[PDB]
Amino acid sequence: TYKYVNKKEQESEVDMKSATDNAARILMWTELIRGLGMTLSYLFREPATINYPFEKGPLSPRFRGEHALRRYPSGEERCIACKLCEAICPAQAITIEAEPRADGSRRTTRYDIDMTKCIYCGFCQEACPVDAIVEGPNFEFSTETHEELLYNKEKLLNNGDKWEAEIAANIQADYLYR
Amino acid sequence: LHHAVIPHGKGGRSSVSGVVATVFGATGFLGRYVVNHLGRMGSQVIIPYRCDVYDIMHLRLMGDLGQLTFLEWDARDKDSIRKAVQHSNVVINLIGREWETRNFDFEDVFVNIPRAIAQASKEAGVERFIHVSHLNASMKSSSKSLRSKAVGEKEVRSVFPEAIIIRPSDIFGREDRFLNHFANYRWFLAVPLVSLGFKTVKQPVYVADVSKGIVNATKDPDAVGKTFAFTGPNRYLLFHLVKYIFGMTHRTFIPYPLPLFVYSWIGKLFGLSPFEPWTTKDKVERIHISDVMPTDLPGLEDLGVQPTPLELKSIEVLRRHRTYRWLSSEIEETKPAKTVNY
Amino acid sequence: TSVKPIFSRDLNEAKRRVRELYRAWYREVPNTVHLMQLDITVKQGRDKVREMFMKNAHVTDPRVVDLLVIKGKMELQETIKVWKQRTHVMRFFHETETPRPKDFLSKFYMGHDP
Amino acid sequence: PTTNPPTARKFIWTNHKFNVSATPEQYVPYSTTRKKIHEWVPPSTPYK
Amino acid sequence: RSRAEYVVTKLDDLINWARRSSLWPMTFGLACCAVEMMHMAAPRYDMDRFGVVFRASPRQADVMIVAGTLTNKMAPALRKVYDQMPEPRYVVSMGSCANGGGYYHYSYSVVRGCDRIVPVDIYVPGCPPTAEALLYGILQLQRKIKREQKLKIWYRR
Amino acid sequence: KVSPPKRAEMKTSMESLIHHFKLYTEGYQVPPGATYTAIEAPKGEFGVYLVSDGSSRPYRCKIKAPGFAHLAGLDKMSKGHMLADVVAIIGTQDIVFGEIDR
Amino acid sequence: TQLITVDEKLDITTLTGVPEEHIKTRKVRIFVPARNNMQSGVNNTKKWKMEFDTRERWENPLMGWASTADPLSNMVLTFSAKEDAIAFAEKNGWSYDVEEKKVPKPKSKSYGANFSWNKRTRVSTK
Amino acid sequence: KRPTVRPRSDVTHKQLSAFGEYVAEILPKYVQQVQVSCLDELEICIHPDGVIPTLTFLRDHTNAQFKSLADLTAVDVPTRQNRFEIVYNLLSLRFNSRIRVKTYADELTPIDSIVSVHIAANWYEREVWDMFGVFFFNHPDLRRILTDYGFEGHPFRKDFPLTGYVELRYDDEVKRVVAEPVELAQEFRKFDLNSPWEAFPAYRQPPE
Amino acid sequence: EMVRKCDPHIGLLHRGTEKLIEYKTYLQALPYFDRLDYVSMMCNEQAYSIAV
Amino acid sequence: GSDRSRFLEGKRAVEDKNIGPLVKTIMTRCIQCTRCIRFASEIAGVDDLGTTGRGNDMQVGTYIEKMFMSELSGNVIDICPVGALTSKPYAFTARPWETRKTESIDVMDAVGSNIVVSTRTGEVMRILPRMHEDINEEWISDKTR
Amino acid sequence: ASATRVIQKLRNWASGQDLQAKLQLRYQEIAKRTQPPPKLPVGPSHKLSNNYYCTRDGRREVVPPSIIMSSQKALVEKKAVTPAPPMKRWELSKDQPYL
Amino acid sequence: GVQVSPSGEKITHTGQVYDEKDYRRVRFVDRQKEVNENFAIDLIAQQPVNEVEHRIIACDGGGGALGHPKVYINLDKETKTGTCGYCGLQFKQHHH
Numbered sequence A: 001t002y003k004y005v006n007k008k009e010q011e012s013e014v015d016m017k018s019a020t021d022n023a024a025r026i027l028m029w030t031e032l033i034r035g036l037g038m039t040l041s042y043l044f045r046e047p048a049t050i051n052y053p054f055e056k057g058p059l060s061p062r063f064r065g066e067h068a069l070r071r072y073p074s075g076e077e078r079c080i081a082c083k084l085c086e087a088i089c090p091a092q093a094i095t096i097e098a099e100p101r102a103d104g105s106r107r108t109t110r111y112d113i114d115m116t117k118c119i120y121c122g123f124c125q126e127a128c129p130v131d132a133i134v135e136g137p138n139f140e141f142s143t144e145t146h147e148e149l150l151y152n153k154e155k156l157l158n159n160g161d162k163w164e165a166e167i168a169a170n171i172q173a174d175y176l177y178r
Numbered sequence B: 001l002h003h004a005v006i007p008h009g010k011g012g013r014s015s016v017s018g019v020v021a022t023v024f025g026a027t028g029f030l031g032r033y034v035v036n037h038l039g040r041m042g043s044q045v046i047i048p049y050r051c052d053v054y055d056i057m058h059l060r061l062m063g064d065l066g067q068l069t070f071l072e073w074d075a076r077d078k079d080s081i082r083k084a085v086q087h088s089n090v091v092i093n094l095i096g097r098e099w100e101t102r103n104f105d106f107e108d109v110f111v112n113i114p115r116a117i118a119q120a121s122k123e124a125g126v127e128r129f130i131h132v133s134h135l136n137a138s139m140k141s142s143s144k145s146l147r148s149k150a151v152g153e154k155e156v157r158s159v160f161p162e163a164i165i166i167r168p169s170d171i172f173g174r175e176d177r178f179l180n181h182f183a184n185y186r187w188f189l190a191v192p193l194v195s196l197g198f199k200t201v202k203q204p205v206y207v208a209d210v211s212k213g214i215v216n217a218t219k220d221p222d223a224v225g226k227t228f229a230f231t232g233p234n235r236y237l238l239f240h241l242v243k244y245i246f247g248m249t250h251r252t253f254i255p256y257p258l259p260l261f262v263y264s265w266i267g268k269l270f271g272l273s274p275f276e277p278w279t280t281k282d283k284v285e286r287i288h289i290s291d292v293m294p295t296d297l298p299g300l301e302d303l304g305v306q307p308t309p310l311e312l313k314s315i316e317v318l319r320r321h322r323t324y325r326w327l328s329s330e331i332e333e334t335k336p337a338k339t340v341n342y
Numbered sequence C: 001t002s003v004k005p006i007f008s009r010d011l012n013e014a015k016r017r018v019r020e021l022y023r024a025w026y027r028e029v030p031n032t033v034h035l036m037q038l039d040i041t042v043k044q045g046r047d048k049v050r051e052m053f054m055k056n057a058h059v060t061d062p063r064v065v066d067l068l069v070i071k072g073k074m075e076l077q078e079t080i081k082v083w084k085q086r087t088h089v090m091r092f093f094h095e096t097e098t099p100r101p102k103d104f105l106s107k108f109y110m111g112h113d114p
Numbered sequence D: 001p002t003t004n005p006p007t008a009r010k011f012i013w014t015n016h017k018f019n020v021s022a023t024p025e026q027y028v029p030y031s032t033t034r035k036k037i038h039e040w041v042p043p044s045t046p047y048k
Numbered sequence E: 001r002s003r004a005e006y007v008v009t010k011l012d013d014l015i016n017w018a019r020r021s022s023l024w025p026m027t028f029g030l031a032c033c034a035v036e037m038m039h040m041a042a043p044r045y046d047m048d049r050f051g052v053v054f055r056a057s058p059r060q061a062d063v064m065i066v067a068g069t070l071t072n073k074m075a076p077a078l079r080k081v082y083d084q085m086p087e088p089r090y091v092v093s094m095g096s097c098a099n100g101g102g103y104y105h106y107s108y109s110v111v112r113g114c115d116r117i118v119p120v121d122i123y124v125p126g127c128p129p130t131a132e133a134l135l136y137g138i139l140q141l142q143r144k145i146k147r148e149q150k151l152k153i154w155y156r157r
Numbered sequence F: 001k002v003s004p005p006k007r008a009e010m011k012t013s014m015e016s017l018i019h020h021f022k023l024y025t026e027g028y029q030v031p032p033g034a035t036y037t038a039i040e041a042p043k044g045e046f047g048v049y050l051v052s053d054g055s056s057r058p059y060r061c062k063i064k065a066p067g068f069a070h071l072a073g074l075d076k077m078s079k080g081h082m083l084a085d086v087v088a089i090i091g092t093q094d095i096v097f098g099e100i101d102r
Numbered sequence G: 001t002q003l004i005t006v007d008e009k010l011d012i013t014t015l016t017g018v019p020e021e022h023i024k025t026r027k028v029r030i031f032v033p034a035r036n037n038m039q040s041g042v043n044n045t046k047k048w049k050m051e052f053d054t055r056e057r058w059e060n061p062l063m064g065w066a067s068t069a070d071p072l073s074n075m076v077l078t079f080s081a082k083e084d085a086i087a088f089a090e091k092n093g094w095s096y097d098v099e100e101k102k103v104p105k106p107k108s109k110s111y112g113a114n115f116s117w118n119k120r121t122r123v124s125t126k
Numbered sequence H: 001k002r003p004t005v006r007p008r009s010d011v012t013h014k015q016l017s018a019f020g021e022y023v024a025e026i027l028p029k030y031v032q033q034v035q036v037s038c039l040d041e042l043e044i045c046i047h048p049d050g051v052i053p054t055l056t057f058l059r060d061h062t063n064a065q066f067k068s069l070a071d072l073t074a075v076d077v078p079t080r081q082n083r084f085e086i087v088y089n090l091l092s093l094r095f096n097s098r099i100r101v102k103t104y105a106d107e108l109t110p111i112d113s114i115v116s117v118h119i120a121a122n123w124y125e126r127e128v129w130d131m132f133g134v135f136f137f138n139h140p141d142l143r144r145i146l147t148d149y150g151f152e153g154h155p156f157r158k159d160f161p162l163t164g165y166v167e168l169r170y171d172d173e174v175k176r177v178v179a180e181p182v183e184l185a186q187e188f189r190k191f192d193l194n195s196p197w198e199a200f201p202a203y204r205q206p207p208e
Numbered sequence I: 001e002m003v004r005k006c007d008p009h010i011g012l013l014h015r016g017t018e019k020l021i022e023y024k025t026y027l028q029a030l031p032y033f034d035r036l037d038y039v040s041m042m043c044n045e046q047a048y049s050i051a052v
Numbered sequence J: 001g002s003d004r005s006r007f008l009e010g011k012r013a014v015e016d017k018n019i020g021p022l023v024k025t026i027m028t029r030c031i032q033c034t035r036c037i038r039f040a041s042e043i044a045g046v047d048d049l050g051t052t053g054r055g056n057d058m059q060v061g062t063y064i065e066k067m068f069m070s071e072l073s074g075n076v077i078d079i080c081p082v083g084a085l086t087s088k089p090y091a092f093t094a095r096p097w098e099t100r101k102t103e104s105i106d107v108m109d110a111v112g113s114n115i116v117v118s119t120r121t122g123e124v125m126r127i128l129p130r131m132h133e134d135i136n137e138e139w140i141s142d143k144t145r
Numbered sequence K: 001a002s003a004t005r006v007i008q009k010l011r012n013w014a015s016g017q018d019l020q021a022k023l024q025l026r027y028q029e030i031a032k033r034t035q036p037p038p039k040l041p042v043g044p045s046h047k048l049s050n051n052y053y054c055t056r057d058g059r060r061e062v063v064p065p066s067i068i069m070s071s072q073k074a075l076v077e078k079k080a081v082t083p084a085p086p087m088k089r090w091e092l093s094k095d096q097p098y099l
Numbered sequence L: 001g002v003q004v005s006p007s008g009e010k011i012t013h014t015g016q017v018y019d020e021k022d023y024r025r026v027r028f029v030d031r032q033k034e035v036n037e038n039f040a041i042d043l044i045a046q047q048p049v050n051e052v053e054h055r056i057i058a059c060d061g062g063g064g065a066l067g068h069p070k071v072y073i074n075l076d077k078e079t080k081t082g083t084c085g086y087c088g089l090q091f092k093q094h095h096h
């Protein structure tokens, strides 16, 4: 079905009262006055402005922020150097090198994420089979040089150690959906 | 050699040239071109800086990621100097002022700081040191700056015996204080030249030519322990040079013969300024000192650089100083200045 | 070995179109140097135009010559109507790009690229 | 996190750090792998 | 220290306060990141409340927020409007495209980061960074230019 | 074999783990063929001409944006108009440039 | 009136826009890729591939990444026939090396040979 | 019935087959192949000489009325003699249908432009020329539309590298934005994401 | 101030999206469609999803 | 196969073997296909591998703690379809989609075995054989590999 | 929502609309930020029998397109047809046909 | 644990440290090389060996779907504990 947005049906003819109403509308600027009144109502409303940085906009546990590498509760790294995140990364922002550790464990020797190349899509955290790489909810990590956004394994493990109290709670609140 | 200093790539932005160069006067006029060439070939350029980070922001795009290491330094801080030159195989000295401040004078700037840099470099065991002196800064010159640069040459040679000493002529470029200086002479009524600009010979050298010579000195095995003379291909009288400058500006040309003592007086009067002075007594003395003819010294050709002529590179500097009427004027509409063989 | 022509039946009128395009470029070079504030001279621009034509001078296929003429006319229009900027015009000179030497010893000293 | 504190782990930072950009505590990237190609070391004794 | 050093430090504080309380960006954007930039202009975050007001001409601009993919065809124009800004100017790269190419890093027609073209003061990461993150970058830039010591360096010269 | 399984199924089942691995490394293979799928986008008809060669990567993906045709028709709509009218026409054509340029 | 004769090599190098170095100094290889010995599947040995000679990959000083300088490092082209790949290489002006397709030899398989009365093909285990 | 398989209607397939027979018998001079996909899409593959008559007939015939050109594009298959397959997707609002018309070209045989049939073909053929190098005869103004000014090469070709040959950077010596031969800090890592096992037996090509 | 001719030069936001898509997998090529029409992100997702 | 599992029970697990520092054994992944047994019997000619046990407890390997080291012993790493017999020098280093393949010739002897050099990010990662019926068929020596 | 009645009457008169019934600021009607855990349902193929993949393999039911005519394969009174029956005219809306 | 080089630079858990003559320490001059202090190899060495009764144990890392994929470890070798290939936990069969 369809409807007309501007087509008028029949005519209203001509009347002295209607002509006087249109004359008053043209001369006394009635629609302009009611536009003024609308802006006046908005003036006397309450603004929708939060007091940043003391107030923050609401988010969800699903929010994709700064990357981090998590651990098991024992303290062992969750990552097993399987390169699924590297394979699924649409921007090729992940570089992984690996070798057996001194105890024979399958661990990374290089895990780099170019955050200037990353598109913050969460494909790494949804392809990780052991929940090692995550996008924790940090978003206020802007730097002053281009280099500081080239994360390596030490930076990502430090982020995982810093944000574990929040990332674990978000994964607890979210993991039944995924 | 170390495995991380072996050159790699095709010499582009992301290549490795094997040059770890600490450039000290990198925030100035010649320094930006030197850093641009080093980062263009792809090199680890350490910039010790004294001015603001905003003032060094223009250098930040001259190399790839992580190839430019900015660090604060103080000229009175030997610890800062040695931490700047600690990881380097080339140390390049471009420190210099055209005037004297209440903190640093010509003696400190051209002797004590180069000697400190060379001493720290020799203690840190860098392979190559390059020091920029001036042409015709021999000794017993009429200006204090040239005598200071001569004593600085002697001190740098005494401390670091195989220091490559590069002596360029009056460098011209986009941000120079030579062509821009003579173009800014238009803001006054006339051009007060000493003896009408005659008996004063100059052969200015392009800043890109000087920077290419410095980079080729970093790379050149036969440049060690030598003194190079970086001069342009053509020598001009000062009158014909200023006439050509004002012709390229299309502004006007009213020369005026002014004797040197009162010219130094008004240069001193301009030089007593708290900010950067328009001119100084030392500046007008270096203007009216003739350039010596480099006969025995090697030069840009011996370092592999063809000296680009002022007639070819003049319009990239002096087009700014034109008015709207003459703004879209080509090279061929200005008559080139007469050269002198002597 | 028999193909459909684009514009030229053989090489003669293809060379005629090439000469017309070279004439148009030769006339347009001084206007470009005057309009865009170019450091180069008029001699250098015409030398660059001749260098580009001589770079393409080795072809003997009329269809390829016609397509080269079409491309040259497109670039000529991009220069006539000021769509190429000063950077786009000066990209023909490669003045910031150092050239790779053509001798075996220099290529041996530089790297592994032949 | 006063009525519902987070789970305590021994590797969790006990002291939060703010954004340390343009400070001496800032992050500097580096390759975390060791050297892959080992050069031959010439002997320190002359042949003759 | 000297009495004049204290006066110079206070004058530096005053100049930095003025320049950080009045930051006018150029009305310049390229993509989705510029959509988040006008969502920062939106009533929730109120850059105007922070004192940050868009100006269309680069002559009246103080900062340039590179918000989007800087292409090869766009790079001369971006450099031109950066150069036409007056001297106390700053650059805030926004998003992965302007930072380091992002999702189009290996493209034939994309400049791999706007720091190859203009000197970037502050990098804001994200794709897109939220308006919260862009506002955070603006406040970080305000702190950075509060840290400037121009008259103190001039006095120590 | 097309959509990834749930994470619990992936961590408890062999087939789900294999399919998760293959979908997030190689991806599903699309049978070879070409299609043009058009969707009523807010700015107009958004079309995708997809050509699949039988592998896990698309051989060709042409994106048809309505703004491309609208901006091509901008010159026709601006005949006999002024600068502010041209600004109004650009506004009313609902033009975004990512889909135009691709 | 709409058909001319061209007795030439069909050279389009001046139209492709490739720089002269990456035409003259480049070598391409036209080959059916070998079957990956970690698998028994042979579906990747069906089409001809043209690839380029390997150039220098060095280490990035900042991060250790594999930096490259040639643009034709990931360029692999797929062709249905060897002569089609030949035509494309000659058309684009690249020198080529052609490797003939290695079809696996037919083999006589007999399950009953594992239990031979006198021959040595009798196995000792299963 | 099956929740994971697309439902299939045979009426659209029958109608498109009938219309394909209709167009093929109306224009036997140019039509080389007519096919209907299992996705219920009609494709008519024609000789390049018949692009103008075929497009004009489809736009102006009473029983066709394909008055809207959905899009015009090219596919580079560099294993045939005519590597560029030019594709026209057309929409008939009168009959609520869509059709696809294909033709072929190589680097040196231009095809006729259909700007005189559809005006959108102007920018569409500009894009095809800019991205593939397929010249179009009688175009009002053919030039580049998406590449940079002075860009050399057609980047949507298969043999053109993904990163291109040149990259831009600001040089401070010349105070300009300049083009250099491309160098990458990290090379694009290509992946061999092809299973060695056949996935679709219906598309098994016979051995050579 | 009358307008005699409009010549829209575009491609200043051209990023080779189709070439990158043909060099990536289908799930990898999905978030390009978010950035094609960055006001109609879910609509472009729906279009690409229906095509695949 | 299907896209899901109906197996609701517990899986079996097998202790690993130590046949040598070249071939790493994780025998839980073994599908008892006897390719390694047939190879070692027929081509290597060593008769050291076999199946011990019965039923679901049938295990491939050596009954005693024996070091399976002949020449041509990395080809069991090649022909094991599962990752039960993997390469210990290559352990955890790369992935096949990462590895670029370069078809080259082996020079460790004068047979001239056609090989594939798997290189990732400008570093040689692996050596695999190439099928050449007239030289080395499907296999290479241990020194080559 | 904290506006006085005087300001509320002023805003409602100035706008012509009852603004307090539809406030653009969310106060309490929104969902709680903490939710009870879900239990998502399984699809139709989550069954232990009569669930062979060959009976629901929609991806492998794709066939190559059927050639209606070919210049090489076929080597070549009825009514004229249309690609489809002509599209039926849209009915005008019975809800609100005109604005 | 974090150890220092003779240069004084911290050695990472991958064993990476720049040499004395390596020029790339200038990136750490006036800055810091940040090293993750908690070494996972030492942390997983600190875990006690789980003493179970069955011949085959199952490990998923704990937390069910929050852990790693569920694998089975065969504790037949009485001279060596069975290590989970994902989480690094060690198990030993109690034969008493």
Ligand SMILES: COC1=C(OC)C(=O)C(C/C=C(\C)CC/C=C(\C)CC/C=C(\C)CC/C=C(/C)CC/C=C(/C)CC/C=C(\C)CC/C=C(\C)CC/C=C(\C)CC/C=C(/C)CCC=C(C)C)=C(C)C1=O
Pocket: E026, E027, E028, E029, E030, E031, E032, E034, E035, E037, E038, E041, E048, E053, E054, F095, F096, F097, I039
């Ligand atoms: C979807 O597709 C796309 C688009 O399409 C829709 C795009 O668009 C697009 C581009 C996107 C962008 C560029 C984003 C830009 C964002 C927006 C367009 C939205 C933001 C909205 C606005 C800009 C509208 C703002 C409206 C307002 C009302 C704000 C007010 C602004 C003003 C300019 C007016 C106020 C003035 C000022 C702030 C300056 C005023 C002050 C002064 C000049 C001071 C003068 C005072 C003195 C000098 C007094 C001195 C004398 C004294 C005596 C003082 C005494 C002093 C002492 C020290 C004692 C992209 C990429 C895109 O993809």
Ligand SMILES: NC(=O)C1=CN([C@@H]2O[C@H](COP(=O)(O)OP(=O)(O)OC[C@H]3O[C@@H](n4cnc5c(N)ncnc54)[C@H](OP(=O)(O)O)[C@@H]3O)[C@@H](O)[C@H]2O)C=CC1
Pocket: B024, B025, B026, B027, B028, B029, B030, B031, B049, B050, B051, B075, B093, B094, B095, B096, B097, B098, B104, B109, B132, B133, B134, B135, B168, B169, B170, B171, B172, B177, B178
């Ligand atoms: N320019 C010319 O025409 C010629 C110059 N030369 C010589 O070449 C060198 C470079 O030339 P040019 O670029 O013109 O010089 P500049 O006037 O541009 O200054 C060079 C550099 O020296 C630094 N500098 C000066 N004094 C000090 C100090 N006390 N402490 C720390 N740094 C200091 C400046 O740093 P900052 O900005 O932080 O103060 C600046 O970066 C100088 O030695 C000059 O004498 C030789 C021949 C001709």
Ligand code: SF4
Pocket: A085, A088, A089, A090, A091, A092, A093, A094, A113, A117, A118, A119, A120, A121, A122, A123, A124, A125
């Ligand atoms: S969020 Fe996406 S783009 Fe970023 S690292 Fe993860 S997979 Fe790569």
Ligand code: SF4
Pocket: A078, A079, A080, A081, A082, A083, A084, A085, A086, A096, A124, A127, A128, A129, A130, A131, A132, A133
């Ligand atoms: S997907 Fe997870 S386990 Fe695999 S390499 Fe990436 S972070 Fe490590």
Ligand code: SF4
Pocket: A119, E031, E032, E033, E034, E067, E068, E069, E094, E095, E096, E097, E098, E102, E103, E126, E127, E128, E129, I035
């Ligand atoms: S970084 Fe992401 S959101 Fe920002 S411009 Fe690029 S594609 Fe758009």
Ligand code: SF4
Pocket: J029, J030, J031, J032, J033, J034, J035, J036, J037, J060, J079, J080, J081, J082, J084, J085
């Ligand atoms: S080849 Fe591998 S899967 Fe086959 S029996 Fe031997 S170890 Fe088991």
Ligand code: SF4
Pocket: F018, J029, J081, J082, J083, J084
């Ligand atoms: S990759 Fe293959 S062999 Fe390895 S665990 Fe998976 S199914 Fe088993």
Ligand SMILES: [K+]
Pocket: J076, J077, J078, J079, J080, J081, J082, J083, J084, J085, J086
């Ligand atoms: K194996």
Ligand SMILES: [Zn+2]
Pocket: L059, L060, L061, L068, L084, L085, L086, L087, L088, L089
């Ligand atoms: Zn475990």
